[PDB]
Amino acid sequence: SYNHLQGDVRWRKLFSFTKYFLKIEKNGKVSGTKKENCPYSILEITSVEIGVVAVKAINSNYYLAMNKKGKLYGSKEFNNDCKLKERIEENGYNTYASFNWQHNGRQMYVALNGKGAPRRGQKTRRKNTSAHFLPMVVH
Template identity: 65%
Template sequence: MEIRSVSVGVVAIKSVSTGLYLAMSKKGTLFGSVRYNPSCKFKERIEENGYNTYASLRWKHRGRQMFVSLNGRGKPRRGHKARRRHPSTHFLPMLPT
């Protein structure tokens, strides 16, 4: 995955192998988008523990942010099911080698 800065604190996440952008629907479902659009923008926050969280810039659920989250098997979770402090939302960016 490649993380590109769009503006201050806002990123776009793109798959290097497929060329698809990570996007979130209004219902909080993650999907791959061929074209970059407003659903592909995520707020990046560096947490106190050194991990990063990514919340949809465009969509909210009942006033709460929806986060990119993976379950224990690596499958995406719906955005409104996860909270910022939950470990399933924490990601550790790595520099390419």
């Protein structure tokens, strides 16, 4: 049984240009999967202010978060790590930066590497293919 913050809700899968769907498993670990069918990849994205979202994995009940040190992790409770900057890019895809945390005046991104692992935020750049996401409507 899931909840959301006050805001504009939409239901999506997030598929990286590294060709993984983002999921958070029952253990709160954040990974990619090739599985088009995976229920831990169904996300509720709610906009709470302009360009600011909280992304929750419905079927595990975790928020996609990133911490000061720049690790992706799953958070049971909403907190400041769960605020993300959603930038609708260029042509056809989105990026998700830490709202709260920078590295050397550089944004830190949610990214899935080529073997489907989460990246350490310090190593990520907006131009990266790992940090690009084609949202796909769930229903």
